Structure 1
Amino acid sequence: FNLDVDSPAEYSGPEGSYFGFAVDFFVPSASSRMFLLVGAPKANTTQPGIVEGGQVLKCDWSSTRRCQPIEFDATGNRDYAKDDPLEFKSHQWFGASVRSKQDKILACAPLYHWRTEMKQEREPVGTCFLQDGTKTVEYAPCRSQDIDADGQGFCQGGFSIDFTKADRVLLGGPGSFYWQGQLISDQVAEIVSKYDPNVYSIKYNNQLATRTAQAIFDDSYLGYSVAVGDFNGDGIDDFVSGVPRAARTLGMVYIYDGKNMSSLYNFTGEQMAAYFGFSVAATDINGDDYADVFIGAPLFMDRGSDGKLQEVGQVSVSLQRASGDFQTTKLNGFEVFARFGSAIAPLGDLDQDGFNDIAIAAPYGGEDKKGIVYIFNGRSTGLNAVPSQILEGQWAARSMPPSFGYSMKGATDIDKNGYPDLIVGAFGVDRAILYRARPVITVNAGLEVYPSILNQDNKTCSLPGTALKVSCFNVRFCLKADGKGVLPRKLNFQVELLLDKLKQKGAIRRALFLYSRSPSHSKNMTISRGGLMQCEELIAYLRDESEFRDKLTPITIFMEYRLDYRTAADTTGLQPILNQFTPANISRQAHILLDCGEDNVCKPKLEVSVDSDQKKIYIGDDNPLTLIVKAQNQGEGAYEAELIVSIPLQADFIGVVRNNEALARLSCAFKTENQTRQVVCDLGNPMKAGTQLLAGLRFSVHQQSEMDTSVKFDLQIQSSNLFDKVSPVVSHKVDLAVLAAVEIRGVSSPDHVFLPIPNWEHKENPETEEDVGPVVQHIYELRNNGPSSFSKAMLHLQWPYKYNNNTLLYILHYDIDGPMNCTSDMEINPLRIKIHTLGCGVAQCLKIVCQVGRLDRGKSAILYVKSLLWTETFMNKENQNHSYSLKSSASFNVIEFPYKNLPIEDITNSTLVTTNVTWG
């Protein structure tokens, strides 16, 4: 929110040169001056025979606003033979990737082409030039003896580059190995020490590189983007790369160990063609000193209110935990076709609040599709989901979209103001813009009234114009402000004071200042840096007795303060900004003395009472929880009476009861400011005598623990009176209860087997599954629906194995689904066969007993029993033509719950599954 959009730094290269396609800061240790690095591919150079080789320009903050091209190659194409070029270098897009660490600058040409020195070819290998001081070396790791598309020839290395904490480059290239992509990492010293200008392919010691994979990974485009961070305890920056076309164009992000190049973690997009991994960035947004992952998907399509797909883009925010796998949240875009996730730029701590911040850019959104950059502040809980500022493109369309925000670089403080600044590239208009962060001031203002209660018969002060004694009070307004970084010593504040803010426009003022004789006053204050809260005074005379007829209603003293711009740094137009979330105005209230008794002081007696209409609250689900509050004041009036509901962490307070006349509404608002959640309800200002008020507040508890027995609510009333200002704190608890609705269901597949079996004969020793009979399938499902879960349960299956010594339903196999084990008292499939009513009562029984694990709401446990009808036992002699109903029963018993030390009860039921065989 502190970025200055009034007077940024405009940089413009030549037109058509994509000036601004890549940006970075340059902070050499050689000097105190800092420079801007702006890549500009498609830029015509002095290189002989080279058309649009591309440049990298050095722009200075010296305010001359001038850029100078950096000499990297300055030479044309080397030759493999006479009239046979070795390199081509025309339209090589040099400067498409520019990154600098300290005194070293790395720039790359991903469209650089090679002759391969074996056959005559033009292969987009890509090359880079690493410059340190006067010396310049060429780094082209993808240029090697591995040539064709199955090699590194189309790799286009230098497509994305990054440094690490200690002298190591991370270079990606999408075209390696039939466009599987590749990451190559080399020590900076190795690149400089091993350079041989007469050697076109240089072998670097300690080179970390990914290797070719199976052809199913073709066209993944690994190395499309790169970022660095530490995602394990080693301490060295590791490798993060987006793979936008990976996994059937879902998009992937790979994290490789920065030491031995092994894979560490993975990310995958949820939507195809969204280009998940187009942009990647690594920063610590929550201050827990663990690097967090940012992944852009500019073409992601969410659903609008109508439900139709719309392309707004989205960014994946993954917070790293010290234990393991991340916590990932999604941030959707705003405008359609804006490509919200195109560029993700970390920028230091922008507001110097202690938590790092970040900027996400939508280059084609905004007014006239000029481009928008969104600034997101970090917090203790992670990234704030809401932008704190937006940057709008100031440049028109011309041939191609301005693409403002297509490239960004932050995190570096180019002026001494003490706040990191930001570079935004456009390249559509061939421009680059620098936004300087403004300093942040945190200001707190106190207001007090001497005294808070006014007596009209107590007239003391004399009016200036004429001599009359008037009831008066004092108002003191104190002001203190400070901030980090560079900012002036003394600050100019303009403060306004308003008396009786309630009654205004057409109304009675009821209060005015002594000297100015006015309801309002203005003051010019000047304070200095930290501490030293200054104060001033003008005093508040009260109007004539019975000049209003309006007693009771408090006189609200209102102070608001602004900042006259004036003071600023030598930065020529950088003025500070007030803190983002902080009140610019503070109010106090004086009350006229009314019905305070003979002591002339109002001492109330406040009382809170709550009965229990709600008794049981069930664990595992939200549910209506309504408390009826009875707040009564027996005694003299209570100034600014408020009901304070101190809630637990599980509260989730909503609304109030409207539907009853017995309890008449209320004014309640949820708020949490200092270390505590609570609900505040206004009981009237003043809350007069009598005043027995009934009301209700609705809550939905998402509970906690599963070791919790109760939930705690504490209630009391507070007021501004000097004596007996509060009420005794009353506590009401409703107990957690366990209710789990568990059902057992079954089905026979099929429920019918018609006799005789078509094309069936009798084998006396069969192992077929065809000679036994048809497949009868019983499926039993134990499902827990009720809100509470259970930890352990037992399941007993009774199965009709035999009737009169011969088989009824021969079980081949049984399978489980969910947290359950099962055991058969008799060996299942003992013959090793491979692919009226008959229950387990009055028939030979085969028992299957099962132990059930934890079953929550949405989950169940299933037992699949595949059996064969034994045709030989039917159809033969004692069973020839009769109707038999095969019956199997299954019962369940819930034996335990995770909610131990809470009431339990028990759950038990049973269902039976029947298979009827018939003749006719």
Structure 2
Amino acid sequence: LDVDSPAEYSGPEGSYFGFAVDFFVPSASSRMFLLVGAPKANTTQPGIVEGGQVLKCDWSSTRRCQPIEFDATGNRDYAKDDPLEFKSHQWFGASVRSKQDKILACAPLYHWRTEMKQEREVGTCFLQDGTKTVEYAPCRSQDIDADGQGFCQGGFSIDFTKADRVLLGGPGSFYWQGQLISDQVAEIVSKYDPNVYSIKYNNQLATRTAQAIFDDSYLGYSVAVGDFNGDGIDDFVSGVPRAARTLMVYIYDGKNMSSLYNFTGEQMAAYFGFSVAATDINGDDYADVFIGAPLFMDRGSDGKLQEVGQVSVSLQRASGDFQTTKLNGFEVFARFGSAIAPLGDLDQDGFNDIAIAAPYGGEDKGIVYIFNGRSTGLNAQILEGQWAARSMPPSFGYSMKGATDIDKNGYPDLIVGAFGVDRAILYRARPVITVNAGLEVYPLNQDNKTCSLKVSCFNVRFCLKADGKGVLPRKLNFQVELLLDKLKQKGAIRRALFLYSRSPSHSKNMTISRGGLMQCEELIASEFRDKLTPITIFMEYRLDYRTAADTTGLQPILNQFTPANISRQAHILLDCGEDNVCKPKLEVSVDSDQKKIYIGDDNPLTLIVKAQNQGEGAYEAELIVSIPLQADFIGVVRNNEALARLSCAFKTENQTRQVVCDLKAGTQLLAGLRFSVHQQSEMDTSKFDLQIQSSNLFDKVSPVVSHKVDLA
């Protein structure tokens, strides 16, 4: 989703604008409308206040939000001193749905002058059929009592069925048990007669009453539709948040109203069933079930309860092979769960996804989570309501709908409401781009010395490709970055370099087109003391998002997965390749030939040096002829009967004598090794060993030597 440049809307103060959200479209036209409820708006209609509105806000180029076709049509009367409706206590705009040319806007707190008595109770819905507008009130049909559909609040939650049926949910349709009402659109509009206040439709399918055990369950609190038995007709899944001893979600057949599998939670008061979504994550057409528990609380990191919320993914598979998993929240009191918005292929690279929001998380303002779906699901983006509270918690994410595309996306775009601040924001989904790449090393060492002045020249691979589906700009300007050698300290050095530039790294600019064609570049890869450590090849890439956006300004995005940052190793001959495994056998030994030397600035004590390692890769073998304190290599031997150019370097860091001499077989590069032994401490008397520092000779076991000298 996109958060940097969204589209936002607002309305009258205190109007609860954005409490309900959906998408209106025109029949085979691009003038799509982002329907959004304003249930608390003052009504600009005769003889009525406190009615609310459903505002049509266009998609682009304008922020105008205008009321529905039903406007300037006030309270109808019953007699000369009695209004037919007790409107001015309603919430018109609390639930909005649209399929192709239809509106289902409902006022769950609408009241009407009843016929049985003079009381007021029912919820009403105002459809639209092209120009004609009709009234829907399935809970108004002679069932005027709290025992039945009097307190129905019908239309609190509504949904659409592929058979062109409308699934209406009134949690109070029964004694707050709730009921699903499904009526065909053709039957509703055809049977319209305004003088009849309780129109009956013949093909109505609705859930009947239950026992007194079921009560206050709010069956119609949340609704969704899917196929859960495999007959091509959408079943009715419903959010019953307070069922099974307030621990539920019901599934009803589309054409039979029969009871399919029920889902229950293990936590209490978590409100398991506040929102329900029906989509596919695993891959098979058998639709999954999602249940929200925004008040879920479990044992935390400190061993104490914390309310973080939780959701449930039900991988409903045929023949009873059901699998379930639970996703936990992350921020305390954030009410993670709440609005679960079934998105669909928010990323086309795979199957559908789900948006779960936290209306009271983040700094100070609302939080939205995103869960991408992969095979078997179990995949357990972030959005914030940066709008600040005015006089009410800005419940960002409380209302959400992301099932419908509104652009040249394929991905479905997301609408978010912030009713507590009187506003609604459009989160447009972004075009996903997946990428793959790799590289390897082709080239022998001594033959590279003939590369030009002569240097060493090697080769590696430069292959990357993205391709990707969807409608987005054909050519994408990718930035790629590569490293010659990695795992180096800030002070470490390079070994392989680009001869044309000697740069230890290189980044490339490419405007690659979208396609399956493979595109790779071309490049060719005794002054360095480091041999043993392997050369590390590294690969990095990115995309100039700013110029890659379309005319609408929708920013492209690379794959949210596919972590990149990939790297591989390499090795070159003549470093230790002269040895097949480069395993050394040191036996590094020296001896103190001379003894009985007087103590104190006398003639230097003569020692001997010899080598014992037989490893084939005995490059850079070190001669650290360690000595005790108060000694130094005074009088470097010049005779050099078998000595080599080993000249030592001396230092006394942290009271450690360096005397580092240097050199492929155990050989007696021997000469008189002298030491000043200028001991000034008369109370002391008389530890000689060869320290290991050669990586080519380094091993987990270092056969060394240890000897002393006799002084008198």
Output the TM-score relative to the length of structure 2.
0.79
Q: Where does structure 2 lack aligned partners over 5 or more consecutive residues?
A: none
**Alpha-carbon shift at residue 650 of structure 1 (Å):** 63
CA contact under 8 A between 2:586 and 2:697: conserved in structure 1?
A: no
Change (3 A) 1:323 1:200: same
Alpha-carbon contact 2:270-2:294 (below 8 Å) kept = yes
Return closer, same or farther for 1:700/1:428 CA change in 2, 3 Å cut-off: farther
Give matches, 1:288-437, under 5 Å.
288-324=284-320, 326-368=322-364, 370-385=365-380, 389-437=381-429
How far is the alpha carbon of 1:573 from its aligned partner?
2.7
Q: CA 1:438–1:471 in structure 2 vs 1: closer, same or farther (change >3 Å)?
A: same
Counterpart position of 1:88: 86
* Cα distance between partner residues in 1 of 2:360 and 2:219: 25
Residue 629 of structure 1: how far off its partner (Å): 39
Report the CA distance shift for 1:155/1:530 in structure 2 as closer, same or farther (over 3 A). Answer: same
SS at match of 1:532: coil
Q: CA deviation at 1:23?
A: 0.6
| Deviation for aligned residue 1:478 | 2.5
Distance 1:213-1:692 versus aligned 2 partners, 3 A rule: farther
In structure 1, how many angstroms separate the alpha carbons of the residues matched to 2:599 and 2:118?
Answer: 74
Q: Partners of 2:652 and 2:425 in 1: how far apart?
A: 40
CA distance in 2, matches of 1:287, 1:722: 56
8 Å contact 2:531–2:575 — kept in the other structure? no
For 1:562, what is the secondary structure of its paired residue?
strand
Structure 2 partner of 1:206? 203
Return the offset for 1:258.
Answer: 1.3
Please list, as runs of the form range in 1=range in 2, the aligned pairs for 1:623-634 lying within 5 A after superposition: none
Q: What are the superposed Cα offsets for residues 452-485 of structure 1, whole Å, 9 maximum, x if unpaired?
A: xx524752122xxxxx222322344233221111
Corresponding residue SS for 1:58: strand
Deviations 1:298-322 (A, max 9, x none): 2222121233322222212212111
Residue 507 of structure 1, CA deviation = 2.5
Measure how far apart 1:88 and its partner are: 1.1
Q: Is the 8 A contact 1:294 1:316 kept in 2?
A: yes
Distance 1:227 1:676, change over 3 A: farther
Tell me if structure 2 keeps the 8 A contact 1:39–1:56: yes
Distance 1:129 1:502 in 2: 67
> Map of 1:83-482 to 2, 5 A cutoff?
83-123=81-121, 125-250=122-247, 252-324=248-320, 326-368=322-364, 370-385=365-380, 389-451=381-443, 454-456=444-446, 458-462=448-452, 468-482=453-467
Which secondary structure does the structure 2 equivalent of 1:265 belong to?
A: coil
Listed one character per residue, the Cα deviations across residues 586-636 of structure 1 (whole Å, up to 9, x for unaligned) are 434443323778899999999999999999999999999999999999999
1:676-723 Cα distance to aligned partner (Å, 9 max, x none): 99999999xxxx99999999999999999999999x999999999999
Task: State the distance in 2 between where 1:282 and 1:706 align.
Answer: 91
CA deviation after TM superposition for structure 1 residue 91, in Å? 2.5
Using a 3 Å threshold, how does the CA distance of structure 1 residues 30 and 713 change in structure 2: closer, same or farther?
farther
Q: Does structure 1 retain, via aligned residues, the 8 Å contact 2:642–2:668?
A: no
Could you say what secondary structure the match of 1:414 adopts? coil
Distance 1:654 1:204 in 2: 113
Please provide the CA RMSD for this pair.
16.5
What secondary structure, in the 3-state scheme, does the structure 1 residue paired with 2:688 have?
strand
Equivalent-residue separation in structure 2 for 1:33 and 1:615 (angstroms): 103
**3-state DSSP of counterpart to 2:167:** strand
Q: 3-state SS of the aligned residue for 1:317?
A: strand
Match of 1:565 in 2: 545
Q: 1:302 to 1:512 in 2, by over 3 A?
A: same
- Matches of 1:406 and 1:31, distance apart in 2: 30
Q: 1:58 Cα deviation (Å)?
A: 0.9
1:9 positional shift? 0.9
What's the CA shift string for 1:231-258, capped at 9, x where partnerless? 11222111122222333323x2221211
Change (3 A) 1:253 1:680: farther
Q: 1:649 to 1:36 in 2, by over 3 A?
A: farther
Contact preservation (8 Å) 1:647, 1:713? yes
Cα separation, 2, equivalents of 1:701 and 1:201 = 116
Q: Is the 8 A contact 1:514 1:538 kept in 2?
A: no
Structure 2 CA distance for aligned equivalents of residues 549 and 158 of structure 1? 78
Q: Contact conserved, 1:718 with 1:726, CA < 8 A, in 2?
A: no
Range moving further from structure 2, 165-174 or 510-519: 510-519
Greater strand share, structure number: 1
For the residues of structure 1 that align with 2:603 and 2:89, how far apart are their CA atoms? 66
Could you say if the C-alpha distance between residues 592 and 257 of structure 1 is closer, same or farther in structure 2, counting changes exceeding 3 Å? Answer: closer
Cα deviation, 1:47-94, whole Å, max 9, x if unaligned, reads 222112111111111321222211226422222221112211113101
Q: Is the 8 A contact 1:656 1:665 kept in 2?
A: no
CA separation in 1, counterparts of 2:348 and 2:93? 32
| Alpha carbons 1:716, 1:727 under 8 Å: kept | no
Cα drift, residue 664 of structure 1:
36
Q: CA deviation at 1:729?
A: 36
- Bigger mean CA deviation after superposition, 511-520 or 598-607: 598-607
CA deviation digits over 1:103-122, x for unaligned, max 9? Answer: 11111000011221122101
Structure 1 residue 418: deviation in Å?
A: 3.1
Tell which deviates more after alignment, 211-220 or 405-414. Answer: 211-220
| Conservation of the 8 A alpha-carbon contact between 2:590 and 2:610 | yes
Quickly say closer, same or farther: Cα 1:134–1:182, change in 2 above 3 A: same
Selected match of 1:595 from 557, 564, 575: 575
Question: Deviations along 1:540-579, whole A, 9 cap, x unmatched?
Answer: 3xxxxx4333222222233322222353243343232122
* Deviation, structure 1 residue 537: 3.2
Alignment length, in residue pairs? 711
What 5-or-longer segments of structure 1 have no aligned partner?
463-467, 541-545, 736-919
Partner Cα distance (1:441, 1:130) in 2: 40
Pair 726,89 (structure 1): closer, same or farther in 2 beyond 3 Å: farther
- The answer to which of 419-428 and 647-656 deviates more is 647-656
Q: How far is the alpha carbon of 1:352 from its aligned partner?
A: 0.7
Could you list the per-position Cα deviations for residues 145-184 of structure 1 after superposition, in whole angstroms to 9, with x for gaps in the alignment?
1222112111111111111011101112122333222221
C-alpha displacement of 1:213: 2.8
Q: Is the 8 A contact 1:596 1:603 kept in 2?
A: no
Change (3 A) 1:576 1:677: farther
TM-score normalised to structure 1 length:
0.62
CA distance in 1, matches of 2:596, 2:207: 60
Q: Is the 8 A contact 1:607 1:717 kept in 2?
A: no
Contact 2:577–2:617 (Cα < 8 Å) also in 1:
no
Q: Tell me: CA distance 1:705–1:448, structure 2 relative to 1, closer, same or farther (3 Å).
A: farther
1:279–1:631 CA distance, 2 compared to 1 (3 A): farther
Contact 1:719–1:725 (Cα < 8 Å) also in 2 = no
3-state SS, counterpart of residue 482 of structure 1: coil
Assess if the C-alpha contact under 8 Å between 2:588 and 2:613 holds in 1: no
**1:737-770 residue CA offsets vs partner (Å, 9 max, x unmatched):** xxxxxxxxxxxxxxxxxxxxxxxxxxxxxxxxxx
Distance 1:587 1:29, change over 3 A: same
Residue 239 of structure 1 aligns to a residue whose secondary structure is strand
| Distance verdict in 2 for CA 1:598–1:261, change over 3 Å | closer
Q: Percent identity?
A: 100
Q: Provide the C-alpha distance between the structure 1 equivalents of 2:150 and 2:504, rounded to a whole number of angstroms.
A: 81
Contact kept in structure 2, 1:666 and 1:695, CA below 8 Å: no
Distance 1:264 1:510, change over 3 A: closer
8 Å CA contact 2:187, 2:201 repeated in 1: yes
- Structure showing greater relative contact order (alpha-carbon pairs closer than 8 Å, 6 or more residues apart): 2
Q: Could you tell me how far apart the structure 2 residues matched to 1:632 and 1:691 are?
A: 6
Cα distance, 1:44–1:533 mapped onto 2, change above 3 Å: same
